[PDB]
Amino acid sequence: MASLIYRQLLTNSYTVDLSDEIQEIGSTKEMQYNRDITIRFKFASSIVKSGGLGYKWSEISFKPANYQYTYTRDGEEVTAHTTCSVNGMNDFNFNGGSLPTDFVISRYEVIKENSYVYVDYWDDSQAFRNMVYVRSLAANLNSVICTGGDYSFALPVGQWPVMTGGAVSLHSAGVTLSTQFTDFVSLNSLRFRFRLTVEEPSFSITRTRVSRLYGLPAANPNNGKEYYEVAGRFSLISLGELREEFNALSQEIAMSQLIDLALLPLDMFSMFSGIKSTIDAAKSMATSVMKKFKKSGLANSVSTLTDSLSDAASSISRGASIRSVGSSASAWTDVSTQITDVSSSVSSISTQTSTISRRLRLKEMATQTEGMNFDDISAAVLKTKIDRSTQISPNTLPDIVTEASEKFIPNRAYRVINNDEVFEAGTDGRFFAYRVETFDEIPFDVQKFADLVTDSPVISAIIDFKTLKNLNDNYGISRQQAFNLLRSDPRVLREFINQDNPIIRNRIEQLIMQCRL
Amino acid sequence: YGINLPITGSMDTAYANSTQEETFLTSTLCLYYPTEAATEINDNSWKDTLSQLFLTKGWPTGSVYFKEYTDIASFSVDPQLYCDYNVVLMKYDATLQLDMSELADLILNEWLCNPMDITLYYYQQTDEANKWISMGSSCTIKVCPLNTQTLGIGCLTTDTATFEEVATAEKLVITDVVDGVNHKLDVTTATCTIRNCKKLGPRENVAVIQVGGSDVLDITADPTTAPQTERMMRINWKKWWQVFYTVVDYVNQIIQAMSKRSRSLNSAA
Amino acid sequence: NYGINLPITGSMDTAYANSTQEETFLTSTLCLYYPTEAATEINDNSWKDTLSQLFLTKGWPTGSVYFKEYTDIASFSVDPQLYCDYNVVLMKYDATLQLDMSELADLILNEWLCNPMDITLYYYQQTDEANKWISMGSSCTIKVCPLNTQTLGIGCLTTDTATFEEVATAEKLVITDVVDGVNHKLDVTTATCTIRNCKKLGPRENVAVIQVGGSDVLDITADPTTAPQTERMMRINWKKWWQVFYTVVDYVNQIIQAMSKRSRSLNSAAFYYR
Amino acid sequence: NYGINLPITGSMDTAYANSTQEETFLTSTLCLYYPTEAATEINDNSWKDTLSQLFLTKGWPTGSVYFKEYTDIASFSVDPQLYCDYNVVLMKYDATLQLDMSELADLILNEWLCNPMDITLYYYQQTDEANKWISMGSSCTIKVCPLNTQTLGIGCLTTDTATFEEVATAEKLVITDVVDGVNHKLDVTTATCTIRNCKKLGPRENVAVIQVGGSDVLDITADPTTAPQTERMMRINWKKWWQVFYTVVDYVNQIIQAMSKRSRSLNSAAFY
């Protein structure tokens, strides 16, 4: 369960980039409210002549244009402002020749089906001003046809060429967010963009060689109209410190109900379901949550073990001297056996065990093992509280999740059975040796340990010795059960905690209290 | 953090690897040079260029600082070592040798001082480690040894024209008198400050790097000893850009010859 | 077998083969390098000859000893085609020339490996504490410009050498050292200079720089941390030049014994050196 | 090394350690020697550069390959200093200069040991088929006078060099050979020449003289009996110089493989 969710992430990080790379290109260089809407707008043009005799034009282009107006909606007069701009315009030209007396248009813009028209809109009602958290918005608008008027090119001598025709229809396409910054204040808006379809009539330039072209030129796109209008309706659907609360919020999680929710592959789609946000948060956020992971504890560490294998299997000819408590070199055992890069205070064994725990432990998880794996107790903690909070906003979800990994279940140990011998690497401190059956302790070994750890399945000892031996005596514990209570079987464990209620309910609970972060 | 002492000696034999990777992350490096050094470099961005070069050797941008002493006398006088690790560049000026020796003796070592009132109490040094370190604008110290009666010996405790002059207008002076003898002191307190210091531990920081000559320096106040420490390095002289390149190319080597101060470590009492 | 590595049996037979000086007297050449001033002060047309007869005393056959005249530390540091088996060079303390002297010592006293550098087409970088740039000639003037990982200047424009950093102004011998592991566009005055990329190492089992005057000090470390004092680095108290030579002769073997053949040359090594 | 005393083991483990060319690409330098005419015909300010990028193809990192310009076989013969690990020298068949070329090949392609001779005070003699007198400089003119066992001339007066026997008239590189085991008073023009006594031997695991032009060979040998043909003696068919270089690049490894890396030490082959 947690197994996935966690790992599932580091698996899908490669994505982080692609997405990341988008917002750049694109980056720079509750309560519902309704309202029919009337969008009136117009284009503007810039026409620049070349110098010389006066037969040549250098540029005919679109320019943003503002419009202001008032209309009635629900018995109230609404004042609205719009700004119309275009994107993806096409550069055309006309070359009548290189003589000073030959008609030329060096560059004129035309909007076609690969172009967009944007109309920014603001009005003075109250629902509009109260839009700062937006969970969702759709518009149902009529289309409008924009047709080109004539534009005469007044040559110094003779008959004047005239650009005429051209037309496109505008269709509501995609709804976003947006905001206008003028000399002092801001005008929130979710400017829609219109996709275009070319329409009749085509355009041409009389007296020349330009006819039967489709699209709308920038020469006279308003065709003498005071404005173009698109009307319809739109519907809107609307809605350090952190830690100290997570902790307290944990002190209540049930027991049985928890465990279970650690036998359910709470993967990707699951975790970011409950969250309810304004926009593409949880989305690029499930991606940001990523763009946090690949930059933290769990990350690098795992990235290390990985190499420590390659490097030590690739080297060999020059295998690191290191050292190995066990048959032979093998990252897991040895690399920890030697790079006891920290120091002072107690006894031998414990130190390696420990350092061999670090890798072995936490680390192991994100790969292969049985029964409820620590983390799957952690995930449970998360998918829990991260729901009993309700929040939305981006800057939160990331990190906090990550950080959960690095700081959950500070310590914890593991075990490896083999011939009825529970070998328990009590991380940090301790280590014991069983006789599986009659819960007993005989000299533990750094050796027998070495290997049997390296390449065999491990177990995230839910309950360890302490709890176990104390459990075995004041109860019974059939050989049957026991054998399961080791593999950290879901069932058999769930039973007790659910049924009996003695000890077991502390070894468990205590862990919850430990994933306090 | 502090007070008491006895470590276990078992040979666990586990060296904790690297050590330069904690100093790159957590420590500051302060480079002291003379004006002439920078003037010869003649760039408005030399401090900057060297800093990027310092990332190579492993010191994060905001890590290294560049302090300009313009003379050995002022530097000797304004000693408020700013960073964790201080490596001071000294240029061989042959007339200023003792000025340099007195300054080295101060940085390279750990000092303990108390204030002296030359006006009201005639003092005496106690052991080979009790010295009088005075410094300021113009330090001029005249002394008058007292016999066991508070009477002069070769002087009249009344007229300083009979005193014995042992320093004529220095910027830093470590004065030494025959141990176990009282002396009426006559310093020019107007421009000088004289304090009674007890020496001791050597410094786990500075690293006086000497440019030029083919010196041999001389601290020990005595004649019998000559101590040569690791925090006393040398670079034959010629071009300043080269000096700095070397200091950068061997930062760790230089830092390793120093480390954590010790007298300033938190863990004290 | 002589073009590979062979390691010796360690048994303590324990039998030293006697003399050693009686093979070097017969088979080796001794080359004495001195400055002009040295000979000028001697003022005899037969000093080289007189000393040679005196050299028979110490055991060197007539045609054995040669006398080479460098007139300055700068030129000598230039055409160092050490001619004989054993070279003992006499250096007179000139205090302004110290580093000139240091750079020259660093070259003779040590074993060097070099390759040529094309300052014009490829910006280089030094690799370890043993990769240095040794340039020498008429007038060596080296300006440098450190490159970031883009081939862009750092405190300089790889385009205008007026922004470069000058690290040598007209020297006759220069061992330049830059921050290891950084590329640099170099601007030497190749007209009068030659700059080559050398890797250091083996030392010299020959020279024996004997220093006249001062209270001496030689730095051969580029770093600040180390100071190496070798046997092939001797010092004599300046009185008169005739006295210096008398001593060099009166203690030829002692001086030779502090060197010894030329491990890198000898025959049994022609492969990895020679 | 101090070692050569103890054999080496002959067991056929039989495990070839693969490639070889991947150590030389990383760690060695390649120096190309050509004549001026070669470069002049190429007429580009960036030919050295273009070829260098082309050299990355064959596997030689940018700062690896160097281009040295000899302008004549005689100068390239006088003051010798092979600069790089691997040296491949391009020689253009010039038929009048053949022996000049032979004497130069004999020097690069082989391993030389040289002691100095004092023509003034001491009349010398060569010992074996490997003791030769290699002299070189501005203008080398060597006259010789064989001595009988009395220090007396044989067909000459050790007193007047007008009776000597001229064996070299103003060459830039000369490997002189005299009847072995006979003393000779020598008369070189030491002003412009330098004559040194060399013992031959090892060969060169570097020089790969690539010959442009003609047909015909040359027998470095001084005798008449032997003719040695080595791998470090290659030949290319002339078309244009650009083509020559393209081939040298297209077959760098093949050419390098015909050499080795032992033998580089001090440049100037004569050993004083």
Q: Which chains touch B (3 or more CB pairs under 8 A)?
A: A, C
Give the pair of three-digit tokens for residue D271: 């050993």
Instruction: Report CA-CA distances (Å) from B218 to B7, B228, C40.
Output: 37, 10, 38
Q: Give CA A491 to chain center in angstroms.
A: 35
Domains of chain D, residue spans = 27-112+200-261, 113-199
**Closest-CA residue of chain A to B11:** A348
Beta bridge partners of B85: B29
Please compute, for residue C59, the number of CA atoms within 13 A of its CA located in the half-sphere on the CB side.
15
Amino acid at D264: R
Is C153 within 8 Å of C146 (Cβ atoms)?
A: yes
Identify the burial level of A215 via C-beta atoms within 10 angstroms of its C-beta, where 0-12 means exposed, 13-18 middle and 19 or more buried: buried
Binding-site members of D are 44, 126, 155, 163, 165, 177-178, 180, 250
Amino acid at B265: L
**Closest-CA residue of chain B to C166:** B241
Whether C224 sits inside 8 A of B57 (CB atoms) is no
Q: Give CA D8 to chain center in angstroms.
A: 32
Is B246 within 8 Å of C223 (Cβ atoms)?
A: yes
Give the pair of three-digit tokens for residue C256: 């030779």
Q: What angle do CA A89, A95, A101 make, to 5 degrees?
A: 135
d(CA A4, CA A10): 10
Instruction: List the beta strands (DSSP E) in A392-453.
Output: 414-416, 423-425, 432-433
Instruction: Output the CATH code of domain B26-111+199-260.
Output: 3.40.50.11130
Residue C78 counted as an annotated binding residue: no
Whether B16 sits inside 8 A of A342 (CB atoms) is yes
Put simply, whether C150 touches B (Cβ < 8 Å) is no
Is B192 within 8 Å of B136 (Cβ atoms)?
A: yes
Residue A475 main-chain phi, psi, to 5 deg: -160, -85
Is C192 within 8 Å of C215 (Cβ atoms)?
A: no
| Buried b / exposed e along A258-290 (16+ C-beta atoms within 10 A) | bbebbeeebbeebbbeebebbbebbebbbbbbb
Put simply, whether D52 touches C (Cβ < 8 Å) is yes
For the residues of A186-224, what is the DSSP string, one character each?
Answer: EEEE--EEEEEEE-SSPEEETTSS--SB-SEESSSTTTT
Which of B49, B52, B236 lies at the smallest CB-CB distance from C98? B236
Residue C124 main-chain phi, psi, to 5 deg: -100, -175
Put simply, whether C118 touches D (Cβ < 8 Å) is yes
3-state secondary structure A29-45: CCCCCCCCEEEEECCEE
Show contacts of A476-480: CB within 8 Å, 24+ apart.
A479/A437
Q: Give CA C250 to chain center in angstroms.
A: 24
Q: Are strands B164-175 and B130-146 parallel, antiparallel or unpaired?
A: antiparallel
d(CA C67, CA C85): 13
Put simply, whether C217 touches B (Cβ < 8 Å) is yes
Q: What is the DSSP letter of A362?
A: I
Binding-site members of D for Ca(2+) are 44, 126, 155, 163, 165, 177-178, 180, 250
Whether C154 sits inside 8 A of B52 (CB atoms) is yes
Identify the burial level of A161 via C-beta atoms within 10 angstroms of its C-beta, where 0-12 means exposed, 13-18 middle and 19 or more buried: buried
Which of B8, B16, B18 lies at the smallest CB-CB distance from A340? B16
Residue B43 counted as an annotated binding residue: yes
Q: What is the DSSP letter of A266?
A: -
Whether C273 sits inside 8 A of D262 (CB atoms) is no
Put simply, whether D66 touches C (Cβ < 8 Å) is yes
Is A85 within 8 Å of A102 (Cβ atoms)?
A: no
Instruction: Report CA-CA distances (Å) from B89 to A510, B49, B69.
Output: 59, 18, 10
For the residues of chain B, what is the DSSP string, one character each?
Answer: ------------------SHHHHHHH--EEEEEEHHHHHHH--TTHHHHHHHHHHHTT--GGGEEEEEES-HHHHHHS----SSEEEEEEE--SSSHHHHHHHHHHHSB--EEEE--TTT--B---STTEEEEEEEEEEEEEEEEE-TTS-BSSS-TT-GGGSEEEEEEEEEEEE---SS-EEEEE--TTTEEEEEEE--SB-SS--EEEESTT------SSSS-----TTEEE---S-HHHHHHHHHHTHHHHHHTS---SSS-TT--
Q: What is the DSSP letter of A361?
A: I
CATH T-level fold of B112-198: Jelly Rolls (2.60.120)
Three-class DSSP category at C240: coil
Q: C115 contacts in D (CB within 8 Å)? A: 29, 83-85
Whether B56 sits inside 8 A of C167 (CB atoms) is no
- Tell me chain B's radius of gyration from C-alpha atoms: 22
Which of C3, C8, C116 lies at the smallest CB-CB distance from D262? C3
Residue B3 main-chain phi, psi, to 5 deg: 120, 125
d(CA A356, CA A358): 6
Put simply, whether C227 touches B (Cβ < 8 Å) is yes
Q: What is the DSSP letter of A420?
A: S
Chain B closest-CA separation from residue A426 CA (Å): 21
Helix H or strand E segment including D234: strand D233-236
Residue (of D81, D193, D79) closest to D133 by Cα position: D193
Three-class DSSP category at C143: strand
Chain B closest-CA separation from residue A396 CA (Å): 28
Chain B closest-CA separation from residue A41 CA (Å): 53
Three-class DSSP category at C130: coil
Q: Are strands B182-186 and B130-146 parallel, antiparallel or unpaired?
A: antiparallel
**Closest-CA residue of chain B to A341:** B16
Determination technique for this entry? cryo-EM
Is B192 within 8 Å of B137 (Cβ atoms)?
A: yes
d(CA B175, CA D78): 69
Residue (of D207, D185, D216) closest to D99 by Cα position: D216
**Closest-CA residue of chain A to B21:** A341
Resolution stated for this PDB structure, in Å: 3.8
Whether B43 sits inside 8 A of C216 (CB atoms) is no
Q: Which chains touch C (3 or more CB pairs under 8 A)?
A: B, D
Whether B56 sits inside 8 A of C181 (CB atoms) is yes
What angle, rounded to 10 degrees, do the helices at D47-57 and D241-250 form?
A: 30
Q: B215 contacts in C (CB within 8 Å)? A: 217
Residue (of A402, A442, A393) closest to A421 by Cα position: A442
Whether A351 sits inside 8 A of B12 (CB atoms) is yes
**Which residues does A355 contact at the CB level (< 8 Å), separation at least 6?**
A336, A337, A339, A340, A342
Three-class DSSP category at C20: coil
Is A1 within 8 Å of A265 (Cβ atoms)?
A: yes
Helix H or strand E segment including A268: helix A268-271
**Which residues does D21 contact at the CB level (< 8 Å), separation at least 6?**
D59, D253, D256, D257
Q: Are strands A104-111 and A90-95 parallel, antiparallel or unpaired?
A: antiparallel
**Which residues does D137 contact at the CB level (< 8 Å), separation at least 6?**
D78, D172, D192, D193, D194
Among all chains, which residue has been given the structure tokens 């006066």? A54
Peptide bond into A201 cis (omega under 30): yes
Identify the burial level of A101 via C-beta atoms within 10 angstroms of its C-beta, where 0-12 means exposed, 13-18 middle and 19 or more buried: middle
Cβ pairs C/D, distance under 8 A: 61
Q: Which chains touch A (3 or more CB pairs under 8 A)?
A: B
Q: Which of B57, B245, B252 best tests the C interface by mutation, with the highest count of C CBs <10 A?
A: B245
Residue C159 counted as an annotated binding residue: no
d(CA B211, CA B244): 11
Is A59 within 8 Å of A106 (Cβ atoms)?
A: yes
Residue (of A40, A35, A100) closest to A65 by Cα position: A40
Give the pair of three-digit tokens for residue C214: 């001062």
Is C97 within 8 Å of C156 (Cβ atoms)?
A: no
- Tell me chain C's radius of gyration from C-alpha atoms: 22
Amino acid at B23: T
Three-class DSSP category at A355: helix
CATH T-level fold of C113-199: Jelly Rolls (2.60.120)
Show contacts of A239-243: CB within 8 Å, 24+ apart.
A239/A30, A239/A31, A239/A133, A239/A135, A239/A276, A239/A278, A239/A392, A242/A396, A242/A400, A243/A517
Three-class DSSP category at A118: strand
Residue C187 counted as an annotated binding residue: no
**Closest-CA residue of chain C to D8:** C1
Identify the burial level of A109 via C-beta atoms within 10 angstroms of its C-beta, where 0-12 means exposed, 13-18 middle and 19 or more buried: buried
Instruction: Report CA-CA distances (Å) from A486 to A207, A358, A420, A498.
Output: 93, 21, 11, 18
Q: Are strands A104-111 and A56-63 parallel, antiparallel or unpaired?
A: parallel
Give the pair of three-digit tokens for residue A290: 């990523």
Q: What is the DSSP letter of D55?
A: H
Q: A340 contacts in B (CB within 8 Å)? A: 14, 16
Among all chains, which residue has been given the structure tokens 């020749």? A97
Q: Give CA C175 to chain center in angstroms.
A: 11
Give the pair of three-digit tokens for residue C107: 């070259």
What angle, rounded to 10 degrees, do the helices at A446-454 and A350-358 form?
A: 10
d(CA A239, CA A33): 11
Q: What angle do CA C120, C123, C126 make, to 5 degrees?
A: 130
Is C182 within 8 Å of C125 (Cβ atoms)?
A: yes
Residue (of A66, A101, A102) closest to A85 by Cα position: A66
Identify how many contiguous H helices and E strands chain C contains and give both numbers. 7, 10
Residue B186 counted as an annotated binding residue: no
Q: Which CATH code, of 3.40.50.80, 1.10.10.10, 3.40.720.10, 3.40.50.11130, is assigned to C27-112+200-261?
A: 3.40.50.11130
Amino acid at B213: G
d(CA B69, CA B81): 12
